[PDB]
Amino acid sequence: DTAAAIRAELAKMEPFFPSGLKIVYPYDTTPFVKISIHEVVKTLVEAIIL
Amino acid sequence: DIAQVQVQNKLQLAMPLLPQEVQQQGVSVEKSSSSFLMVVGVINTDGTMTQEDISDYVAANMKDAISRTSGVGDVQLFGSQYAMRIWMNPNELNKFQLTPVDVITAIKAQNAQVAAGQLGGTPPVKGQQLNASIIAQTRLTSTEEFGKIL
Amino acid sequence: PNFFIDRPIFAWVIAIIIMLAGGLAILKLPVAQYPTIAPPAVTISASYPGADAKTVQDTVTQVIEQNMNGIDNLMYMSSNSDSTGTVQITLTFESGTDADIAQVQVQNKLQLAMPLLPQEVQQQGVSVEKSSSSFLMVVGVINTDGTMTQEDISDYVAANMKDAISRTSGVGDVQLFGSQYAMRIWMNPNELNKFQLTPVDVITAIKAQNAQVAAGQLGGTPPVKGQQLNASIIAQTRLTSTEEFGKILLKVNQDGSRVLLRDVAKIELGGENYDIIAEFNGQPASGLGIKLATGANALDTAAAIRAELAKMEPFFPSGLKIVYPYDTTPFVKISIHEVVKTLVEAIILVFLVMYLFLQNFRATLIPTIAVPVVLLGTFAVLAAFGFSINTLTMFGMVLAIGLLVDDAIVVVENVERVMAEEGLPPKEATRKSMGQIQGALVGIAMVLSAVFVPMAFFGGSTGAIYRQFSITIVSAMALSVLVALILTPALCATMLKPIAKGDHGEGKKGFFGWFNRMFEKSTHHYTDSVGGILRSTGRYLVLYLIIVVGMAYLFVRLPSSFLPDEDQGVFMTMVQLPAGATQERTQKVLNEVTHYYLTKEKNNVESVFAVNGAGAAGAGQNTGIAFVSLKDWADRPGEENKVEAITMRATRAFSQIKDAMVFAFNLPAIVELGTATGFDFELIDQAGLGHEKLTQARNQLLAEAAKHPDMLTSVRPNGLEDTPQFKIDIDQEKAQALGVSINDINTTLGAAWGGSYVNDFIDRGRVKKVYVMSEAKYRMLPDDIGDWYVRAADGQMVPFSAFSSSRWEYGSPRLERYNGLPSMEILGQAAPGKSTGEAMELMEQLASKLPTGVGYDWTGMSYQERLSGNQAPSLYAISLIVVFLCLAALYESWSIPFSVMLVVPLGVIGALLAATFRGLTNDVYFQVGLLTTIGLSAKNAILIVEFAKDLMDKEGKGLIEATLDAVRMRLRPILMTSLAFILGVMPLVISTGAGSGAQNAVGTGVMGGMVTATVLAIFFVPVFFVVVRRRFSRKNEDIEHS
Amino acid sequence: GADAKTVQDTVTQVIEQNMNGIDNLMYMSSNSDSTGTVQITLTFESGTDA
Amino acid sequence: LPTGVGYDWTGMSYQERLSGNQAPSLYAISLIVVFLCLAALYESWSIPFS
Ligand SMILES: CCCCCCCCCCCCO[C@@H]1O[C@H](CO)[C@@H](O[C@H]2O[C@H](CO)[C@@H](O)[C@@H](O)[C@H]2O)[C@H](O)[C@H]1O
């Protein structure tokens, strides 16, 4: 949630950035929690199929 | 929240016993994680700017708002904000028989905001008919005026 | 359930228990006008004496905006930087945040920013406060003999009254309106110059001869052996008289003469600040703003306060009387009076219908006993969930009466019917019938809470308002069904008199009952007709479809509101003069208005409170406000004696026949909220741009919305436009040359024109301030600059005309910020037929038209709502799904739930009809009303279809016959209730006097809905059941006899 | 160094004046010292959140 | 004592003043709780009086 809010703020700042200003994302504990818990959900449903 | 309250309430009792340099450079009390949740990157692709230009765009356009994001404990700057940098020459200073202290005092004097007053100020005189703001000594703005500092 | 029919004492005991806890809750329960509705806001306020807008924006404001981070649950941060030297930072938080925690976090981050502040600001005190704008009452304090000036009075407040009122029980906050006494030293520049002295020396003097000093002690520790005395050293003491301040030395002259302060400057006890000058019916006054304690009872806080003032009455100085310019309390006294009045009347009407319909006295005593119990209990259930007796919760009960009343009636009736039909003894009739309506009763509770709880989960201020009604009503309802299953059956089975089989009393009596045949005949007429319509149904299906499309049309073409505006015994008129105007001019206007209300409204206006210096627009000499109090409502009978009409003739009065802008208006009801069809735009300077560029973008947008009057309407900025300001360019070179310290130039200039808080002194036992400033006559006009001289290094005086060049420029008097950044506020509302949303979309489109570095944003009201409207469809989809699921349980049908759900429009067409022909608007009271109405139609249809199904299944009767019999036996109760309801509500629909806006809002929609819904349902429901029932199954069939 | 009567109507009663609308306050008592310390105790309704 | 000299209890004596002023109320309710209860379990309306 904290992270989703921050992505909202950065997005609200995007159009007023100087010429050439891109944001990069070198490190975030977020994508692992997301894809990991999603694989566990994949598994429950798969398991119901079996 | 409460722990933070009890802690900062002891910190303010310690504050007067602190240095003025320490005091005004700012002390912070935070309920934070010891690990970064995330690291946000800022670059320029078309490389029309050095790291400082960037460091300042970050510190001057983004970092205040990100640290006001609800739920964000600490934000660390990989870089720094812009500052008025006065880099003294020991030789060219000694030549004129002046010391760093005089640089300090000078800047303190020719650069400031000043409580002025008001034309038609309150409490006025009978029938009086003009009210306006006195604009006095204002902070310096550009770099060059720091050269015209006498 | 059946259980109590054989245990009437146990029932009585639970009843008593509910009554006692409820009565206990009634005794120790809070009262307020409204609950907490607005999101939490905490403001940091600070003042920088003499400084200008840009100064306070650039010495404090930005320093604080930068130091306020990592504070929990922040929504938005908005601030004013005033050229009156005050800076205010609003931090508005997410709704439901711990108010107190937020305020604590804000004030501790500020306590960290404090060392980075100016020394003057730091020492004047920065304050952190919670921001409800809702004072319980505003007490005026005056003098009759023109004995004392307003500074005198203000001080009298601060030194004699303010403390005891804050000792009054139930008073959680006392705010002071005015300024305290100060030691005011008004320098004379001429007699200052005569003696070659500058304000600087005045400063240094006053700081020096007036001070407390760390002394010490005789017999101090560790003393010497045998030592014999311990006592206190009393040293240099602060001054006490004004006179002692006259005797302070500024210089010794060579010829032995001394130069005292008394000489260069007039010295007197006078106001800490003179911006705001207040007059009460012309006579001078000061004021006290009392806020209700947290969770406290309003009526007793007010009563206690008036009593406290009376206990102080004989101790007031000559001519000092206390007045009450603003008081929420009688609005609440009278509204409470009206709600209970309605409840008892309603009870009376249910007795009157119950007699003039069942005419058996002990029958009529049953529902009479029922509801009191239920009310009481709901008060306890509410108390348990931490509410108070306030407007919203009470009109929630007023709405609940319908459901309570119906439930009681349903039971008593059905029992009576079972007797007059079958010849059962009272009790056996009771088990037959409780056992007849039971499932319908639990189901109706499930469906009623199924529509009423989803609206509890609305978010934001809108969500709070809904939450009140939702809980009050569901609790009243759930208790009414428990009571309908435990006590009512007990009361039925026990105290009810037995009826002869096939009685109907179809005559027997001469005086009172010549009606029973008339009703009997007609109830058969009715069912005759119903079968008749069940013959050809199609035509009637058409009628329905028509009714619905029409209902939609009525729904769309009806106006949305938030709440009905209320004459509250009080209104106000605001006054705005041309930029840079004078205290004395604004004051002149305000005296004129004051008189207008005291003239052309000799009979309506009780008292007028003119405040010069503080307004709507902001602070400054340039603005005024008028607080206008109105006579008690009994003395204002007519249509012309009401606030709408008054504010009309006053705005009409001060528009055409004035030289400056004067609006007159009435406050909203929940006094901190928004203008239903309006919005609050924030135009934000996003790039490293300029104030000049931002304002130009603002003009640009004002123009582009000027081009769209079919969508947006009267779109306007909410700030102060630029004023001409006086620039003093100091030549650093010349001043350093002629031998003058720039500091001496600055601080003499300051202490001359802006003033300086120097030291503190102790009057009568209370520490106050010491201000040194020019005299009036030497600091008004720009030329006066010349009268002030700066002493040089050597010992010589220097005119400002020697090193200071001067001019005029433009500048801004009010510098606004949004989220740390430079911003500009833009208020507005939508076109007459157009929706606030459309107007907002167009506004985003226009603001998108702006130059680069210009972003846009929403704040306040527009924030809370842009979140909240996303939810009505979702919550109501939840509701349909849940209710259908419930009815799907109750029968054992996935389809029969449609024969009752199909009934919902029947009631709406009455509400929408009734609002439009009455000229009302689609607001809360109307919406809660619509739901309430849906609630009765759903109840009745659920009972009808239950009965129908029951004869079909557990009696093997046919279809058309079964529904026939059904609607037959359940005609009478329907009609009984609806008679009761329409009669109790009717007062709400036809009422003026206090609070009648809300009362009409409830009453109308409801009444219209009741009428069309029952007088439609008795015909449309049977077709619903029948037509639906005929989409199942394989023959099977249509039917009968097994 | 200040005296009792000094610290009491400069510090004690000044601070005692804002102690209204405090939830669950039972009683408030305060001391004023010429040894230089000034102290105000707030005793609260039993079961109040400390 | 002379007019304007009032009196009070605090701390131990306060709390004691409390238990004293609460004893009758306690006996009213607790007696009444039981009357209500026996009238319930024992369907008799009379068993409570005796
Ligand atoms: C609570 C107060 C109620 C106030 C209502 C005021 C009056 C208006 C509503 C009454 C509507 C009923 O009007 C009803 O029409 C149907 C058929 O369409 C009639 O039925 C009649 O026509 C159909 C065919 O055309 C046949 O079945 C025929 O045998 C005959 O009964 C009913 O005999 C009549 O009673």
Numbering used by the authors:
A (entry chain A): 301 to 350
B (entry chain A): 101 to 250
C (entry chain B): 2 to 1043
D (entry chain C): 51 to 100
E (entry chain C): 851 to 900
Quote the study on this structure.
AcrAB-TolC is the major multidrug resistance efflux pump in Escherichia coli, where AcrB is the efflux transporter residing in the inner membrane of the bacterium, playing an important role in capturing and expelling a range of structurally diverse substrates. AcrB is homotrimeric with the three monomers suggested to cycle between three conformational states known as loose/access, tight/binding, and open/extrusion during substrate export. Crystallographic studies of AcrB have revealed that large substrates e.g. erythromycin bind the proximal pocket in the access/loose monomer (access binding pocket) while smaller substrates e.g., doxorubicin and minocycline bind the distal pocket in the binding/tight monomer (deep binding pocket).The proximal and distal sites are separated by a short “gate” loop (herein defined to consist of residues 615FGFAGR620) that has been suggested to regulate the progress of substrates through the export pathway. During efflux, large substrates such as erythromycin are proposed to undergo a sequential export process, first binding the proximal pocket, then passing the gate loop to the distal pocket, and subsequently being extruded out of the cell via TolC.
The first, AcrB(AAA), contains three mutations (F615A-F617A-R620A) chosen to remove bulky side chains from the gate loop. The X-ray diffraction data obtained for AcrB crystals in the presence of erythromycin revealed electron density consistent with this antibiotic occupying the proximal pocket. The occupancy of erythromycin was estimated at 0.89 for the wild type structure, and 0.86 and 0.88 for the AcrB(AAA) and AcrB(ΔLoop) variants, respectively. Erythromycin-soaked crystals remain asymmetric, as in the apo-structures, and contain only 1 occupied binding site per trimer. The one major difference between the gate loop variant structures and the wild type is the lack of a contact between erythromycin and the central phenylalanine residue of the gate loop (Phe617). The absence of Phe617 in the gate loop variants does not lead to lower occupancy of erythromycin relative to wild type AcrB. No evidence of erythromycin bound to the distal pocket was seen for the wild type AcrB or either gate loop variant. The results presented here suggest that disruption or even removal of the gate loop is not enough to facilitate occupation of the distal pocket by erythromycin—at least in crystallographic soak experiments involving isolated AcrB. Strains expressing gate loop variants were both found to be highly susceptible to erythromycin, when compared to those expressing the wild type (MICs: wild type AcrB 500μM (or 367 μg/mL), AcrB(AAA) 125μM (92 μg/mL), AcrB(ΔLoop) 62.5μM (46 μg/mL), AcrB-negative control 31.25μM (23 μg/mL)). The work reconfirms the importance of the gate loop in the AcrB erythromycin-export mechanism while establishing that the interaction with the gate loop is not essential for the binding of erythromycin to the proximal binding pocket.
